Design a protein around this nucleic acid. Structure first.
Ligand SMILES: [Mg+2]
Ligand code: NA
Ligand code: NA
Length: 1216
RNA sequence: AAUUUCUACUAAGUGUAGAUGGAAAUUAGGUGCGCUUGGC
DNA sequence: GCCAAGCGCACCTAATTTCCTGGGGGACG
DNA sequence: CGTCCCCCA
């Protein structure tokens, strides 16, 4: 139904780079020659050593960083902090704050760069001279020296390290981490300190000062602005984060920090004071913790030795177990008034064992407390009652006996509980005798031996279970009637028992490590800039090039002693030829053109007039306040005339420049050079001579391979295969360029062939898709799971540049708004997140009619009339639970990110098809990053990865099956989001993607716009009366068997957003109360009113309901109102139950019930609650489009797209 | 159950469909368990 | 039984930066 | 004096 072709305007907008990856298959004697020359062994070792030198470099860099950071006093500080906290900042003061912030980052950067040695930190000098002089170990110095003549292999690393010293507000900069992140967090903590300082006791602060600040400072100092300098190094950050978080002493004492005190205060007084934010680490610091933690275990034998020695039936830990066993079996020989349960968790624990639940003791104590202290229920009553309870330090079992049933005995019940726990220990020790004798020997190493770890953990856990049970009986410690006959023997045994605590942690810590696995390593063929680029005039330096033979492509690498061997090969006018690439790139002309033409070589050849010289010297050609259009033109003509005399470029490129007088800046000349400064063609080379080179070992050749190049391949190729071929296709006019920087790696086999699951030839294999009617496949060859990991495999990574010279430049967001404004029937794809439905889709047209709606829990695909349906929701759930249980059982934690990615790529493909079909924009929830981060715990969270892979696709969106040269084909992909720089830099619109407020998109009656604005939580009897009276009427409706509640929202607070105001609610249908029960509203109302003798038929019922005096009537009434206003009804784990039901009637007296539409195949209204949300997310974008239609084009950028809550209820309640 | 790699497959027999930006560096987060002090 | 503040250990996940280069130049045999 | 690693912007 689309009226306007919008996607076609979004091609060739901006450039991006990608990487294509291939297997590289050695040809001929290549592998033998590489083996004989030891190249792979040298490179596997160089990789190890390279990482080692990077670690030594980091030692020097960190030392250089700390010296500078320790020595810096930021100047602005007090100024910046003042403005940063000012609450009434003009736009002019906000630019001011930005300036102060830039200057703070510049103080930090310039302090780094002002050292005279600074430039040397990223050139050959740091490996040749500086790091050797800085090191002392002879072996470390010789590792660094081995890279002499090889420093340009660190060039990328040098860039990583230089990022640390940028003054820019960029994530890998020290200045950013200091100023944008930590100063902000430091300033925030200053406001919190002033709010919360009054709760801290002077002895609490004094403990922190003594035990954390060494009495060298006051806690208050770290909340003064000027003190922020202390916190620039890791050393200061650790101190500051210890003030916040405390630390653990060598004895295991947890010294409390301020956040603990805040949390303790909050829980004591039922308040919610905010807490402090810890500071982030300083870049590159190797930080050691202020908390003590005992040393672990390092070998399977240490663990087995520890486990056998500390836990066998004769060990001192097992002794204490039997000793405590005897103490409890002899309970009645001890005075029950003499032994105590400390109040709090031990009382909760004992309560749940003796009575089933943690709170029964608490409730029974309140019972007798109420009997003394009752004559209605204030907050003051329960505060005093709770304070009185909190005062009781412990309970004797005698005291506890008085809470038991006549059949119950407390002392009895306890001793059978400990007997059960000792029983279990023996039952698990019995299963453990196999590794408790000396002769036993592991066959599988512990970190990969589930069977032995299961046996240890079961034993460990049962001792933990027993240990946690007996810790309840310690009492408070200062009870007077303390049966020291009972406790003397208890404390001795208990204290030995606690020795298990270190053993439990230490074994867990060892046994859950994953076994190390080796990485692929980069190959250099003894060139530090190996394969750096493809330019013909560099072949001899880079020693890698590309060949082609029919449809197959090859990587050709010259041995360093024979760098020229391919250039001495000519065409074979008789027998076969390879095609050898001829690649010319003039990269970054604004840098290379001056470099080449004002070089000593060129100025000597070419007499450049003093005018030309001064023009470049003084920079009168650059766009700026020193510009001179005529100077610019003279320089261009110098460059143009030099090009014609530079055969290296005049013969490689078909230059065709615009007339000089037409240029505005020199940039317009550079752009033409850049675009025409790329040419790729192929030259013939004798196949015989080339193959001789390979046999002789002078040349190494790899077929550049993926399965699309197999002689057996016959289906649609990978998109990346198409990209690769298009690089060399003469119909590609620079839309996709082959880039330099390619890399070659060796990935050693990680599986042995013998251990691969095999499917023998000629034996049937089961097919898995139940909808596939061919149940079985039988092949004449073997197939092996994961075969590719069972052999060493070279891989070749090739960068490409798409839209390197973009012509179609404009504001993408603006243009989208211009199109939607002028579009007659714009379509919107609404997409809703969830965890009942990972993703739900609703497509609407320009009038908001639903065109499609469905869940993406399952991906449905068709192959030749054969359906395949994949329940990815179910797969992700299973993986989630395997990961959860693996974490709990100390077994291997499987990956989930690849399954999510596999799912999301199916989702993105379908959304792309919907975008192209309907020419539609996309509507999403403006989830801030504070909601997306709290749903990370639900490891089926898919929405962040969905956004990421969606925006990636929409940066260059291609239909594989289209003509590569047509709009939307591989050479003309649509670019309908802004180039993806970062999530943080995005706004609420990203090209075709709109982010709208999600308020009341799900919990809303789509047929009427009705929403629940009432607060129905029971708070008091008086509060419920005023609620009831605030209705205009409450009556029973005999002719419908419903209760009707007339209300004007104007009589309840927090309702100004509603538009209709007057609504009649009905007790129509059922609700799901949350375990769960189904509740029929009408009958439940009747049940409630009958319980209290209310004549609910006596017309207007409100006065009657307010005459009640029982608090349980009003709480039950408010509960029933809550259910009536609960339009969304769900059973977790019952994906069949997610319905939406409205308590209000539409125009025709119908109640909306989503179940009436989920039946239908095509439904006009949402089929459930998740579809409702997607539907109204889309409608909110429809509203914003309406706003576009109200503005002039010149003002479309200014149109607010975030509909107000008030605007949305009006919109939703007048659409119908 | 094959893959540049990932997911789902066997798709008609060494493979099929879709996806796929690498590399390096930095940093943050999440799950789980234990321990300390607490709340329900 | 659940949860909070903090410390620790094991694991997996992911955000944000940089580069995607030929040719002059020199150190070095 | 040519080769090869370095360095640039
Ligand atoms: Mg294919
Ligand atoms: Na954690
Ligand atoms: Na915790």
């Amino acid at each position: 139904g689309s009226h306007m072709s919008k996607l076609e305007k979004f091609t060739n907008c901006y450039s991006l780079s990608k990487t294509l990856r291939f297997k590289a298959i050695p040809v001929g004697k290549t592998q033998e020659n590489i083996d004989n020359k030891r190249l792979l062994v040298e490179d596997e070792k160089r990789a190890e050593d390279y990482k080692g030198v990077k670690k030594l470099l980091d030692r020097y860099y960190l030392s250089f960083i700390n010296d500078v950071l320790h020595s810096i006093k930021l100047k602005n500080l007090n100024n910046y902090i003042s403005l940063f906290r000012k609450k009434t900042r003009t736009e002019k003061e906000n630019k001011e704050l930005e300036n102060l912030e830039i200057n703070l980052r510049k103080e930090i950067a310039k302090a780094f760069k002002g050292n005279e040695g600074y430039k040397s930190l990223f050139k050959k000098d740091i490996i040749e001279t500086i790091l050797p002089e800085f090191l002392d170990d002879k072996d470390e110095i010789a590792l660094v020296n081995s890279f002499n003549g090889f420093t340009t292999a660190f060039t990328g690393f040098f860039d990583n390290r230089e990022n640390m010293f940028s003054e820019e507000a960029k994530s890998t900069s020290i200045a950013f981490r200091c100023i944008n992140e930590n100063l902000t967090r430091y300033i925030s903590n200053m406001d919190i300190f002033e709010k919360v300082d009054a709760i801290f006791d002077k002895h609490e602060v004094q403990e922190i000062k003594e035990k954390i600040l060494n009495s060298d400072y006051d806690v208050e100092d770290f909340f003064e602005g000027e003190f922020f300098n202390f916190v620039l190094t890791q050393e200061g950050i650790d101190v500051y984060n210890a003030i916040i978080g405390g630390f653990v002493t060598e004895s295991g004492e947890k010294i409390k920090g301020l956040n603990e005190y805040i949390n303790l205060y909050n829980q004591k007084t039922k308040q919610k004071l905010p807490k402090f934010k810890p500071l982030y680490k300083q870049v590159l610091s190797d930080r050691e913790s202020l908390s003590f933690y005992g040393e672990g275990y390092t070998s399977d034998e240490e663990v087995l030795e520890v486990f056998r020695n500390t836990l066998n039936k004769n060990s001192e830990i097992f002794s204490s177990i039997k000793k405590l066993e005897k103490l409890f079996k002899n309970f009645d020989e001890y005075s029950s008034a003499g032994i105590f349960v400390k109040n709090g968790p031990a009382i909760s624990t004992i309560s749940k064992d003796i009575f089933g639940e943690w709170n029964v003791i608490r409730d029974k104590w309140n019972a007798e407390y109420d009997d003394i202290h009752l004559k209605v229920v204030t907050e003051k009553y329960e505060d005093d009652r709770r304070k009185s309870f909190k005062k009781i330090g412990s309970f004797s079992l005698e005291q506890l006996q008085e809470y038991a049933d006549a059949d119950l005995s407390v002392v009895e019940k306890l001793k059978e509980i400990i007997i059960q726990k000792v029983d279990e220990i023996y039952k698990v020790y019995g299963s453990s005798e196999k590794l408790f004798d000396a002769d036993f020997v592991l066959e599988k190493s512990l970190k990969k031996n589930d069977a032995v770890v299961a046996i240890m953990k079961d034993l460990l856990d049962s001792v933990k279970s027993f240990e946690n049970y007996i810790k309840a009986f310690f009492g408070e410690g200062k009870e007077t009637n303390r049966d020291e006959s009972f406790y003397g023997d208890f404390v001795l045994a208990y204290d030995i028992l606690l020795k298990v605590d270190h053993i439990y942690d230490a074994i867990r810590n060892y046994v859950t490590q994953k076994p190390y696995s080796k990485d692929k390593f980069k190959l250099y063929f003894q060139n530090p800039q190996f394969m750096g680029g493809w330019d013909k005039d560099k072949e001899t330096d880079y020693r890698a090039t590309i060949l082609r033979y029919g449809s197959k492509y090859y990587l050709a690498i010259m041995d360093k002693k024979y760098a020229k061997c391919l250039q001495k090969i000519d065409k074979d006018d008789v027998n076969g030829n390879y095609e050898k690439i001829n690649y010319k790139l003039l990269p970054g002309p604004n840098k290379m053109l001056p470099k080449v033409f004002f070089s000593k070589k060129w100025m000597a050849y070419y007499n450049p007039s003093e005018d030309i010289q001064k023009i470049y010297k003084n920079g009168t050609f650059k766009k700026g306040d020193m510009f001179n259009l005529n100077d610019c033109h003279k320089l261009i003509d110098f460059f143009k005339d030099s090009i014609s005399r530079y055969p290296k470029w005049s013969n490689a490129y078909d230059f065709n420049f615009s007339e000089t007088e037409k240029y505005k800046d020199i940039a317009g000349f550079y752009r033409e050079v850049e675009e025409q400064g790329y040419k790729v063609s192929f030259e013939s080379a004798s196949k015989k001579e080339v193959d001789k080179l390979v046999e002789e070992g002078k040349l190494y050749m790899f077929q550049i391979y993926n399965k699309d190049f197999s002689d057996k391949s016959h289906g649609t190729p990978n998109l990346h295969t198409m990209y690769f071929k298009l690089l060399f296709d003469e119909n590609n006019h620079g839309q996709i360029r082959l880039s330099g920087g390619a890399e070659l790696f060796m990935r050693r086999a990680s599986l042995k062939k013998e251990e691969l699951v095999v499917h023998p030839a000629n034996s049937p294999i089961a097919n898995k898709n139940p909808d596939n009617p061919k149940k079985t496949t039988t092949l004449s060859y073997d197939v092996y799971k994961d075969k590719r990991f069972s052999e060493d495999q070279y891989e070749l990574h090739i960068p490409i540049a798409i839209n390197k010279c973009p012509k179609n430049i404009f504001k993408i967001n603006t243009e989208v708004r211009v199109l939607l404004k002028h579009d007659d029937n714009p379509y919107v794809i609404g997409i809703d997140r969830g965890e009942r439905n990972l993703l739900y889709i609703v497509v609407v047209d320009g009038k908001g009619n639903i065109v499609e709606q469905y869940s993406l829990n399952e991906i449905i695909n068709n192959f030749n009339g054969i359906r395949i349906k994949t329940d990815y929701h179910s797969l992700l759930d299973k993986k989630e639970k395997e990961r959860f249980e693996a974490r709990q059982n100390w077994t291997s934690i499987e990956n989930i990110k690849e399954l999510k990615a596999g799912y999301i790529s199916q989702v993105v493909h379908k959304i792309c098809e919907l975008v192209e079909k309907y020419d539609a924009v996309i509507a999403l929830e403006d989830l801030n990053s504070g909601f997306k981060n709290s749903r990370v715990k639900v490891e089926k969270q898919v929405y962040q990865k969905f956004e990421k892979m969606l925006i990636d696709k929409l940066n260059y969106m291609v239909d594989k099956k289209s003509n590569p040269c047509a709009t939307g084909g591989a050479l003309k992909g649509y670019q309908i989001t802004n180039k993806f720089e970062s999530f943080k830099s995005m706004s609420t619109q990203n090209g075709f993607i709109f982010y709208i407020p999600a308020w009341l998109t799900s919990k809303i009656d789509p047929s009427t716009g009705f929403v629940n604005l009432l607060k129905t939580k029971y708070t008091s009897i008086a509060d419920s009366k005023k609620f009831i009276s605030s209705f205009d009427r409450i009556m029973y409706v005999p002719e419908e068997d419903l209760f009707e509640f007339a209300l004007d929202y104007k009589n309840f607070s927090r309702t100004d957003a509603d538009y209709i105001k007057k609504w009649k609610l009905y007790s129509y249908g059922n609700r799901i109360r949350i375990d769960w029960e189904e509740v029929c509203l009408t009958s439940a109302y009747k049940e409630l009113f009958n319980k209290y003798g209310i004549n609910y038929q006596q017309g207007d019922i409100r006065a009657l309901l307010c005459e009640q005096s029982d608090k349980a009537f009003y709480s039950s009434f408010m509960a029933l109102m809550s259910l009536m206003l609960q339009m969304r009804n769900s059973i977790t784990g019952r994906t069949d139950v997610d319905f939406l039901i409205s308590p209000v009637k539409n125009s025709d007296g119908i109640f909306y019930d989503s179940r009436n539409y989920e039946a239908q195949e095509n439904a006009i209204l949402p089929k459930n609650a998740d579809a409702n949300g997607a539907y109204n997310i889309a409608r909110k974008v429809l509203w914003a489009i309406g706003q576009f239609k109200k503005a002039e084009d010149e003002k479309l950028d200014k149109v607010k797209i975030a509909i107000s809550n008030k605007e949305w209820l009006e919109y939703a309640q007048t659409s119908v």
